[PDB]
Design a binder for these strands. Sequence first.
RNA 1: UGGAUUGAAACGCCAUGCUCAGGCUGGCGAGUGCGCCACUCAUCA
Length: 77
Amino acid sequence: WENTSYILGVDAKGKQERTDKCHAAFIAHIKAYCDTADQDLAAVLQFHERPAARQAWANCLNRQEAAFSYVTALNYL
RNA sequence: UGGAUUGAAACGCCAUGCUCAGGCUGGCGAGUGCGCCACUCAUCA
């Protein structure tokens, strides 16, 4: 998905993403292993876990949609 | 005897607490003070 940034770290780049081979399970493409509204056959994020709570925040500010929501949540406010 | 988001997966290689430096230089335990006074080994085969 899109990139989380602005944490005190090394590159300020995204999390929950696969860029290597040894993170391949039940072979999926590159980011279908963690499918959250990217491939819309099943979403982990609401369709005690953090990115679901993030998405719960990114719809508290508004009075792939799940990825958009929680990665703009990690992008604080 | 298919299938545990599994199965495979070193924090690992190396490194002086070293070089050297007086605890020294001096300072009376001294100045005085009766052990003193007095006492039958006695009485007897």
